[PDB]
Design an enzyme around this catalytic site. Structure first.
Site, mmCIF file in Angstrom:
data_model
loop_
_atom_site.group_PDB
_atom_site.id
_atom_site.type_symbol
_atom_site.label_atom_id
_atom_site.label_comp_id
_atom_site.label_asym_id
_atom_site.label_seq_id
_atom_site.Cartn_x
_atom_site.Cartn_y
_atom_site.Cartn_z
ATOM 1 N N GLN A 190 -3.256 -1.553 11.415
ATOM 2 C CA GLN A 190 -2.773 -0.421 12.075
ATOM 3 C C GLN A 190 -4.030 0.026 13.026
ATOM 4 O O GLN A 190 -3.716 0.844 14.085
ATOM 5 C CB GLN A 190 -2.559 0.716 11.016
ATOM 6 N N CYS A 225 0.987 -1.321 -0.339
ATOM 7 C CA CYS A 225 0.058 -0.021 -0.140
ATOM 8 C C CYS A 225 0.882 1.245 0.058
ATOM 9 O O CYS A 225 1.614 1.292 -0.892
ATOM 10 C CB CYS A 225 -0.940 -0.055 1.255
ATOM 11 N N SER A 226 0.721 1.960 1.000
ATOM 12 C CA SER A 226 1.602 3.343 1.164
ATOM 13 C C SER A 226 2.934 3.028 1.904
ATOM 14 O O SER A 226 3.891 2.785 1.380
ATOM 15 C CB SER A 226 0.763 4.558 1.717
ATOM 16 N N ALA A 227 2.683 3.026 3.107
ATOM 17 C CA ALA A 227 3.763 2.449 4.079
ATOM 18 C C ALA A 227 4.120 1.154 4.078
ATOM 19 O O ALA A 227 4.972 0.556 4.436
ATOM 20 C CB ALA A 227 3.787 3.089 5.473
ATOM 21 N N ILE A 240 1.966 -1.395 5.834
ATOM 22 C CA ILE A 240 1.696 -1.864 7.214
ATOM 23 C C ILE A 240 0.354 -2.082 7.664
ATOM 24 O O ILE A 240 -0.248 -2.976 8.167
ATOM 25 C CB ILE A 240 2.626 -1.542 8.290
ATOM 26 N N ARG A 263 -3.000 -1.226 5.430
ATOM 27 C CA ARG A 263 -3.794 -1.877 4.372
ATOM 28 C C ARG A 263 -3.185 -3.187 4.045
ATOM 29 O O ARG A 263 -3.898 -4.337 4.043
ATOM 30 C CB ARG A 263 -4.053 -1.380 3.052
#
Ligand SMILES: CCCCCCCCCCCC[N+](C)(C)C
Length: 491
Positions: free
Chosen positions: A472, A425-427, A429, A431
């Protein structure tokens, strides 16, 4: 950082009180805020006054106001306890995290139950327990006291359950004599290291808490019902255990690797990082639960080439992308694939986008990846690009999510000797961790049938030991239950 500095049920006023009367300058605690759920507050004492710093998590990472972004609360606190001068107030103003103001509340402890009878404690300890399994309950006898019930055994030769009175006098706890502890946790920790011995020989070993979260998959609906009117409590009890997972991330911290990270402080563990043997770094971790995953961030323009080095090296044949390239104006992932029908070279790696197939929730891209100069290193990589994850929270229709998940699964299973399923996803961790954990649980059911045991918090903790902060938010946590529920109830 044993999460003792996290106080699960405490006001702003209570926090200020506690810091002023029980703390000194440099004292701090973390609390869930009641300006809004999902937001934490870091309350710190400086110059005899208390300041409150906001920490938001909307699902991608922890965003400290006026500070940096972090994978977990423990990793945030550890950072600032080792980096004075970095946490600033109103510009520059160094706020110091020196002394953790610990919590006496046992509520989020794995062993604490309260509201539990002696014979029911026995039922549970006989039902699920083993040697060394224990729990602490409230005393129904003398109200205010507690009881430590322990299974002593040995197969594990069943044997026996013992109850140890815990007295509470002037807000301290003891087992009838000896030391008086300020908290139940201190009592338990002390007799975890110094096991009470029975006058007759038996050693009352406190090995592990009684498991209360593992269910029969077939019963998840009843569980969800039970949790829907306490999902939050089971999440916080999982969060408190992240202090165990502060493993080293040295490589990601190196100067040459700094800008290969999308977020400076969100790094891969050294012991599970993907090591490129083809410079050796990418912000990605192997997740081993037969199907394994690589959980990774979205590409930056300067890591696109390393991403394809990884996919090639690891023999990955399926990619799951759980983000648009940009959302809310911000870039989540740079385009690392050619346009349909195009061919591109990404360093020594060459990929052609053979065909794209659009569905409503996702787009499938059939990519052919080879090493430049070497024909017959070619393999197809199937990129499943999930497009419809909402800006707030998680998907609200388990149907399409489970359709997508089932498709991705069946693609991987049809390919002989396919390597890890790459997920990002972005980071990498939030999604990412949510998808992977769901996929793992559904893989357990699909193999062992609907009668198997599953343990959602345990599976998450197992995955979080392989990459920081996997799963998260509480919304994502609940979503994992909902997804497995739907899967079960569509069988
Ligand atoms: C109200 C019911 C909510 C059900 C939520 C279903 C799971 C959502 C999070 C996983 C999506 C993974 N994904 C989309 C990449 C395959």
């Amino acid at each position: 950082k044993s999460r003792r500095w996290f106080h699960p049920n405490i006001t702003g006023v209570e926090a200020e009180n506690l810091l002023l009367t029980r703390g000194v300058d440099g004292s701090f605690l973390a609390r869930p805020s009641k300006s809004n759920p999902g937001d934490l507050t870091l309350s710190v004492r400086r110059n005899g006054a208390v300041t409150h710093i906001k920490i938001q998590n909307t699902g991608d990472y922890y965003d400290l106001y006026g500070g940096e972004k972090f994978a977990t609360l423990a990793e945030l606190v550890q950072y600032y306890m080792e980096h004075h001068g970095q946490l600033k107030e109103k510009n520059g103003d160094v706020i110091e995290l020196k002394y953790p103001l610990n919590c006496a509340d046992p509520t989020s402890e794995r062993w604490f139950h309260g509201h539990l009878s002696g014979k029911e404690a026995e039922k549970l300890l006989t039902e699920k327990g083993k040697h060394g399994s224990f729990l602490v309950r409230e005393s129904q006898s003398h109200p205010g006291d507690f009881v430590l019930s322990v299974r002593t055994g040995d197969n594990d030769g069943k044997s026996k359950v013992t109850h140890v009175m815990i007295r509470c006098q002037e807000l301290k706890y003891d087992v009838g004599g000896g030391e008086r502890f300020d908290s139940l946790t201190d009592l338990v920790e002390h007799y975890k290291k110094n096991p009470m011995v029975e006058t007759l020989g038996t050693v009352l070993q406190l090995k592990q808490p009684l498991n209360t979260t593992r269910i029969n998959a077939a019963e998840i609906e009843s569980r969800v019902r039970e949790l829907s009117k306490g999902f939050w409590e089971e999440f916080e009890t999982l969060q408190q255990q992240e202090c165990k997972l502060l493993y080293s991330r040295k490589e990601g911290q190196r100067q040459e690797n700094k800008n290969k990270n999308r977020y400076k402080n969100i790094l891969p563990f050294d012991h599970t990082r993907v090591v490129l043997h083809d410079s050796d770094y990418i912000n990605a971790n192997i997740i081993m639960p037969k199907k394994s995953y690589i959980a990774t961030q979205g590409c930056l323009q300067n890591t696109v080439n390393d991403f394809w080095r990884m996919v090639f090296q690891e023999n990955s044949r399926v990619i799951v992308m759980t983000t648009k390239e940009v959302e809310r104006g911000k870039s989540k992932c740079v385009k690392y694939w050619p346009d349909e029908y195009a061919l591109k070279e990404y360093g020594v790696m060459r990929v052609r986008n053979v065909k794209e197939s659009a569905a409503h929730d996702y787009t499938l891209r059939e990519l052919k990846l080879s090493k430049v100069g070497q024909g017959n290193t070619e393999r197809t990589v199937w990129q499943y690009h999930f497009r419809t994850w909402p800006d707030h929270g998680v998907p609200s229709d388990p149907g399409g999510v489970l359709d997508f998940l089932e498709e991705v699964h069946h693609k991987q299973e049809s390919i002989m000797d396919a390597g890890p399923v790459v997920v990002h996803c972005s980071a990498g961790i939030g999604r990412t961790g949510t998808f992977i954990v769901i996929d793992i649980l559904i893989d357990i059911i699909r193999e062992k049938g609907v009668d198997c045991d599953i343990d959602v918090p345990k599976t998450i903790q197992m995955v979080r030991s392989q990459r920081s902060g996997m799963v998260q938010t509480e919304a994502q946590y609940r979503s994992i239950y909902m997804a497995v529920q739907h899967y079960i109830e569509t069988l």
